[model samples]
Target: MMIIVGVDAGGTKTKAVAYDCEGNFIGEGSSGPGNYHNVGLTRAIENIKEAVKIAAKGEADVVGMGVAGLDSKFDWENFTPLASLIAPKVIIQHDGVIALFAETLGEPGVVVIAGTGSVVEGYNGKEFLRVGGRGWLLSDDGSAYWVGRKALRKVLKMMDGLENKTILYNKVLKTINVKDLDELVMWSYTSSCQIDLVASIAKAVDEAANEGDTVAMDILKQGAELLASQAVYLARKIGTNKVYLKGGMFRSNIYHKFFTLYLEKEGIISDLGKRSPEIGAVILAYKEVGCDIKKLIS
Candidate 1:
C-alpha cells in the first residue's frame, strides 16, 4: 500500500505523478514554472505544493523529483530547501538525473538534455559527470536556442552584405511577430522575452533548412555535431556504448532523428526517443520503494 510520487519540474511547467507499488500510474497533476532560479524558493514550493496535493490524492509515502537547473556544481542549495517543503520524505535531483534514470532505468549511461538550455550528462555506473550545458550566454551549444541564435546570426550576416537570401530570416520574423531586423533586435533586447519562446524559433529554422536553406541546414548539422561530440565524450568516459537523450527540444522527431543519424554517422553509439521520462520517473519511484525491477525502460 506504499504510495510514491514522481515529479518532472521544468522551466515553463511542472508535472507530478503518483504511482503504486506495482507500477500502476494513479494520478497526475501540474502547475506553473518550477525552475528554482526563475520562480524563487517560495513560488516554486507553492506550485509544487499545488501539484502535490493533486498527485498525492490523499495517498502518500515518499516522493521523488527531477528538477531542471541543478547539479551541486550549480546554485542548488536553495532548491533543496524547497523540495523539503513539498514533501516530508523526498529526493531532489537534477532533471537530467531522472531522465537518465528513466532512460537507462537507473543503470549506467549518459543523457543529453536540450531544452531552453542544454547539457550533456552521464552516470559512470559509479558517479555522474557533466560536460557542457554552461548556459545561454556561455554555451548550451547544441540546443534549440543555440540553433535559433545561429540561424539569426546567418540572417544578420546575409542582411549585412545583402548576400544570397534565405527563408530562415523570414520564418523567424514571422514566428516572433516582428516585421524587420530592427524589430527583431528590439524584441530580443527588450528583456521581456522568455527563453522557451525564443528557443522555439529553432523549429522554423529546421523547416527552412528542410526547404533548402543551406545556412539553416548547416545550423542543424553543426548543432547535431556538437551534441554528438558531448555524447561521445561521455560514452568514452563511462565505457558504455549507448547514450540516451531527453528534453523538450527533442519533441521534434526531426531533431531527434537527425541527432541519431549524426551520432551513427560519427560512429558513436546512441539512443534517441527511447522511453518517456515521466514513465521512467514512475519506475524510479518503484525502485526507491524497494521494488526489484531492474530492466532499463525502452
Candidate 2:
C-alpha cells in the first residue's frame, strides 16, 4: 500500500498527517514552530523533520506540505530540497494556499486566515490571487496580532486621557500584568514581546467583547468588517459566493460570529473550515496523483 504524507508548518507549530493510498488516515504528529523566517533555518527544518518522521511511521511514498514562510522562489529553493528528502514525490505551497485547498478541496473559493498574522487567498481553476498578507507593519488588519495591538493602543489612549476607560482597557493591563502606563510602554520594547506573545492577548479582547465592553465590541466589529471586506473582494474576483474562515482568531466565538455575520451582510456565505490545513496537505498529495479530493475525503 502506498503511503502519503502532508504537513502544515505555521509560525507557532508544525503538523503532519499520513494516509494510505486507499484514503485511510494512518496517523498524525506535531512539533514546535517551524517557519524559518521566525525560528531560523536549523530549528525550522528540525521541527518539520520531527513531525514528518512521526507521521511517516518510517516511510512515505508521496508528501505535500504547506509552510508559513514558503513564500518565494528563494524560500522554495532553500526549503524544497530539504523536504524532498522525505518522499519520492513532494509538493509544496505557501500556508495560505494550502489552507484555501483545505476548505474548498482545490475548488474555487476564498480563505481568510486570522492567526498570528492575517492573509487573504483565493483560487479559481485558472489563477490564484493573494492580498493583505504584508505582515505587521503594513497589513494583517483582522488578525489576532492586529486585535492585540489594537487593544494595547486603546489602553494607551485611555491612559493618555484621549479615550474612555473600558473593561478592555483593564483587561489588557491585567493580561499583560502591567501596573502602569510607564511599565506597559517599557514592556512593549522588551525582547520578550514577540509576535505570538502579543497575539495571545487577543483572547482578552474577545473576553471583553463577550462581556459587553463597547470598546472591545467595536474592535471586534471593525476586525470582522475588515476581514469580510478582504474576503468579499476575493469572492467577487473569483465569482464564488462561498468563503471560509481559518486560524486561531476564529476560535473565539465573538470573532467568529461577528465575522460570519459581517460576511453574510457583504453577500458572502461563510463557514468555519470543516478540515484542518494538515488534511488539506493530504488532499494535495492525493490530488497530485489525480485523485478526486471529495471522494478521497469522503
Candidate 3:
C-alpha cells in the first residue's frame, strides 16, 4: 500500500496530489498562496499542510514538495519541519526542478518557468544546472513582473516625452490606480501588491499586442526573445531541442506565439508540460526513495 503524495507550493496557490505506486492519481487538494517569500513561513506551511491533508486522506509512504521561493540550500532547509510533519520520508525541491521533471519524467531536458518570477533549469542525467531565477529583485528576466516593470518604465518615459504614447500608457496608469507620473512614483513604493500587481499589467500588454499595438507587440517580443534565449542555451547544453514551458505567462496568445517563434528560429521547439508539476514531485520522491517505479510514471 505504498501511496505517495506530492505538493507543488507555488506563489499564488498550493496544490497536493496523491498517487498509488502504480502512478494512479487518487486525489488532489488546492489552497491559497504557498510561497514563503510572498506569504509568511507560517502561512506557507499552513497552506501546504491543508492541501496535503485533504489529498492524502490518511497516510502516505512518502511526500514530495516542489516549492517556489525555496531557491538556495538555506531556502530548502527552512521547510524541514513541514516535511517531518507530513511524511516519514520526504523530498523537497525548487518548483522549477519539478516542472522540468513534469515533462521529461526525470530524463534529460530543459524547462523554462515564467511567472511573477522566472527560472530556467536543465538536467543532464548527471547533474542539475540552473540558470537565471536569481530572485525577481535581481533577475527573473523576461518574467511577468519583468514585462510589467518594463511596460511601466516605458509608460514613464512616455510621460517624460522620452518615448511616444502607446496603449500601455493609459492601461499601466489604470492598472496601478494612478493619475499620473507622480502617483506612479507614490504607488511604486507604497503598494502592497507591487510584484503581483505589476505582473498583472502583463495582461494589458497581452491584450494590447493582440489588438495590433506595435509597441505592445515589441514588448512581448522582447520578453519572449529573452526567455527563449535562455531556453535555447539550456536546450543546447542539455542536448535536447524540446524545451518544456511551464508557467501562467504562456497562457497569453501573444506571448506564447512569440516565444514559440523565437525558439523555432534557434532550432529548438517549445511545448507546455503535460503532467502537473506535483506529479513531477512524486517522480522525484520515487527516485529518491530508491523505488523501482520510474517506468510507471511516464
Candidate 4:
C-alpha cells in the first residue's frame, strides 16, 4: 500500500501525520515551532524533520507540508529544496491554503486563521486570494498575539494613569504574577520573553471579558469585528458564502460564539475546520498525486 505523510508547520508547533493508501491513519507526531521566519531555517527544518520521522517511520512515498511564513515566491524557493528531502514527492503551500482545503475538501471557501498569527485565505476554483497575514509588525490585528499585546499595552496605560483601571488590567497583572509595574516592564523586555508566552495572556482577557469587564469585552469585540470583516470581505469578493474559522483563538468558546455571531450578522456562513491542517496536507498530497482523496481517505 502507498504511504503518505502530511505536515503542518505552525508558528508554535509542527505536526506530522501518516496515512495509508486507503486513508487509515498510521501515526502522528509533533515538535516545536517550524516557521523559518520566526525560528530560523535550521530550527524549522529540524523540527519538521523530527515530526515527520516520528510519524512516517522513515517510510513515505509522498509528503505534503502546509507551513507558516510561506507567503512569497522567495519563500517557496527557500522551502522547496529542503522539503524535497522529506520524500520522493512533496507539495508545500501556505498553511491557510491547506486549512481551507481541510475544511472544504478542496472546494470553494475561505479560511480565517487567528492563533499566534492571523491570516485569511480563500479559494474559488479559479482564483486564490489572501488578506492580512502581514506579520506582527504590520498586521495580525485579530490574532491571539495581537490581543495579548493590546492587553499588555492597556495594562501599561493603566499603570501610567492614562486609561481607566479595569478588571482586565488586574487580570493581566495576576496572570503574569508580577508584583509591580517595574516587574511587568522587566518581564516584557527580558531575553526569556517568547511570543507563545505573550499570546497565552489572551486566556486571561477572555476570562475577564466573561466576567463583564467592559475593557476586556471591548478588546474581544474589536478583534471579533476585524476577523469577521475579513471573512465577509472574502465572501463578497469571491462570491462564496462558505467560510471556515480555524485557530487557537477560537478555542475560547467565548470568542467562537461571538465570532460566529458576528459572521452571521454580516451574512457570511462560517464554521470550524473538520480536521487539523496537518491532516489536510495529507489529503492534498493524495490529490496532488492523482489519488482520489475520497476513495483513499475512506
Candidate 5:
C-alpha cells in the first residue's frame, strides 16, 4: 500500500499527516518551526524532512506540502529540488491555498489564516488571488505576534501609569516570567524573546479579553477588525461573503467572538474548516495522482 503524505510548514511548527489512497489516516508527525523566512532555510528544511519522515514511516509515494513564505517562482525552484529528499513525487503550494482547500475543496472561496503569522487568499477553481502574506516582518497584520506586541506595549503604558492595569498585565508577566518592566525590557531586547516566544503571549491576551479586561478587549477588537478586513477584501474578489477562518489564534473564544463580529459588521459570513491544513495537503497529494478520495476520509 502506498502512503500519501501532507506537510504544513507553519511559522511556529511543522506538521505531517499520512493517509492511504482511499483517505484512511496512517499517522501524523510534528516538528519545530518550518517557515524558512523565520527559521532559516536549513532548519526549516530539516524540520520539514523530519516531520515528513516520521509521518511517512520513512517511505511515501507522493508528498504534498503547504509551505509558509513559499510565495514565488524562486521558492518553487528551490523547494522542488529538495522535495526529492522527502518523496519521489511531490506537490507544493502556498500554505494559504491549503487553508482554502481545507474549507472549500477547490470551490470558489476565501480563507484567512491567522496564527503566529497571518495570510489571506482565495481560489476560484481556475485562478488564485492572494494578499498580505508578507510574513511577520512586513505584514502579519492581525496575527498572534501582532497581538503579543500590542499587549506588551499596552502593559508598558500601564507600567508608566498612563493606562490602567488589567488582568493581561499579570498574565503576560506570569507567562513570560517577567516580574516588572525592568525584566520585561531586558527580555524583550535580547535573543531570549524569540518570535514564537513573543507569539505565545497572545494566549495570555486572549484569556484576559475573556475576563473582560478593556485593554485586552480593545487589542483583540482592533486585531479582529483588521483580520476581517483582509478576509472581506478576498471574499469580495472571489464573489462570496463566506470566509473560512483557521489557525491557533482562532482557538481563543474571545478572539473568535471578536473576529466573527467584525466580519458580520462588514456583511460577511464566517466559517471554520472541518480539517487541518495537513489533511488538505494529503488530499492535494492524492489529487496529484488523480484520485478524489476526500469523501472517504472520516
Candidate 6:
C-alpha cells in the first residue's frame, strides 16, 4: 500500500500525520519550531525530517508539507532548495495556503490563519492572493504576536500615563516577572528569551479582559476585529462568502467568543470548527504526484 504523509510546520512547532492509500490514518509525528526563515535551512530541514520520519512510519510514498513563512514567491526562493533535500516527492506551501487547503479539503476558497502570526490567502481554482503576513515587524495585525504586542504597548502606555488604565500592566508583569516598563524593556531586548514568550502573554491578557479589564478587552476586540476584517476583505476580493479561521489564537475561548459574536453581528459566517488540517495534509500529499485522495476520504 502506498503511504501518504502530511505535515503542518509552523514557527513554534511542526505536526506530521500519515495515511495508507485508502486514506486510513497510519501514524503521526511532531517536532519543534520549523519555520525555514526563523530556524535556518539546516535546522528547519532537520526538524521537518524528524516530523516526516515519525509520520512516514519509515515508508512514505509521498510528502506534502505546509511550512510556516512560505508563500508562493517567498518559499520559492528560500524553501525550494528542500526539493533536493527531501527527495522522492515533496510539495510545500505557506502555513496559510496549507490551512486553506486543509480547511477546504483541497477545494478552492478563503482561509484566514491567526496564530503567532496571521495571514489571509485564497485560491479560486485558478490563482492565489495573499493579504497581510508581511511579518511581525511590518504587519500581522490579528496574529498572536500582534495581539501580544498590542497588550504590551497598552501596558507601557498606561505606565507613561498616556491612558487611564489597562489590566495587562499588572497581568503581563506577572507572566514575564517584570515590575514595570524598565523591567519589561530589559527582558524584551536584553534577555535571550524567545519572542513567542512575549506572545504567550496573550493568554493572560485574554483572562484579564474576560474579567472586564479594559486593556485586555481592547486586545481581544481589536485582535478579533482585525482577523475578521481580513476574512471579510478577502471574501470581497475573491467574491466568496465561505471563510474559515484556522490557528491557535482562535483556540482561546475568549477570543473565539468575541470573534464569533462580532462576525455574526456583521452577518459574516465562518466555519470556525472543522476537520483538522493534518487530515488535509495527508490528502494533499497524495495529490502531489497526481493521485487524488478525496475519493478515499468520502
Best candidate per TM-score, number? 2
Worst 10 residues of 3 by lDDT: 289-298
Candidate 3 whole-model C-alpha lDDT, 0 to 1:
0.83
Q: Kindly provide the TM-score of model 5 when superposed on the true structure, using C-alpha atoms.
A: 0.85
Model 2 TM-score, all chains together = 0.91
Error at 146, model 1, angstroms: 0.5
> lDDT tens digits, residues 195-279, model 3?
8898998888887787788888888889988988988988888898799987878988888888999988888878887888887
Every model's TM-score = 0.87, 0.91, 0.89, 0.89, 0.85, 0.86
Alpha-carbon runs more than 4 Å astray in model 1: 71-74, 191-194, 248-258, 294-298
Better of 5 and 6 by TM-score: 6
Tens digits of per-residue lDDT for model 5 on 1-298? 7788889888789999988777677888999887787787888888998898898788788888888877777876776677667778888888888777766765688998888888888887678888887767888888999999899889999999998888999998998899998898888788344778888989999889888898888888889789888888888888997999888889988788989998898899899878778877876676678667555353
lDDT digits (tens) for residues 203-239 of candidate 2: 9999999999999988888997897788889899999
Please give the RMSD of candidate 6 to the true structure. Answer: 2.8
Q: Model 4: per-residue lDDT, tens digit, 198-283?
A: 88889889999989888887788888788778888988888897688888898877778778888888777788776878878887
Name the better of 1 and 6 by lDDT.
6
Off by over 4 Å in 2: 191-193, 292-295
RMSD of each: 2.8, 2.1, 2.4, 2.5, 2.9, 2.8
Model 6 misplacement above 4 A: 71-74, 191-194, 289-298
Candidate 4: regions farther than 4 A off: 30-32, 191-193, 296-298
Worst 10 residues of 5 by lDDT: 289-298
Report the C-alpha lDDT of model 6 over 155-195, residue by residue, as the tens digit. Answer: 78888999876566788789878987778778878643465
Let me know the TM-score candidate 4 reaches against the reference structure.
0.89
Deviation from native of the Cα of residue 198 in model 4, angstroms: 2.6
